[PDB]
Every structure is written in structure tokens, then in C-alpha cells.
């Protein structure tokens, strides 16, 4: 559950075109995914990269 996880996070967001994280968890990416918690751990890593880019 490290690095290789980001894969499933992408491969999963890819099969969906690019949703369920694009705006969802991205609704509060600046708030540190404050609008998540429940599932911001697996999406976090992918949510952190969104800010990285």
C-alpha cells in the first residue's frame, strides 16, 4: 500500500474517465480534503498529487 497503490487510484479513476475524485474529493483539496475523511486516505495520495501537478 505504497506507490503501487497510487496505481489502482489512477487505474480506478481512469476507468471512470476521471471522476469520483476529480471534483468529489477535489471539492476540498485546498482544505486538506476536509470534505472527506471517510475515504481521504486512498484518495488523499491521489488528491495530493492533484495539488502537486
XYZ file of C-alpha atoms in Angstrom, residues 1 4 11 13 15 27 31-34 38 40-41 47-49 52:
17
model
C 0.000 0.000 0.000
C 1.828 0.931 -6.200
C -6.294 2.954 -12.910
C -10.036 6.911 -11.792
C -11.760 3.508 -15.930
C -14.311 19.776 -3.567
C -8.935 22.357 2.785
C -6.786 19.250 3.012
C -9.645 17.080 1.811
C -11.549 18.328 4.836
C -14.126 8.762 5.443
C -9.371 10.526 2.023
C -6.530 8.144 2.787
C -5.574 14.164 -4.031
C -2.132 15.368 -3.015
C -0.796 14.739 -6.500
C 1.365 18.761 -6.797
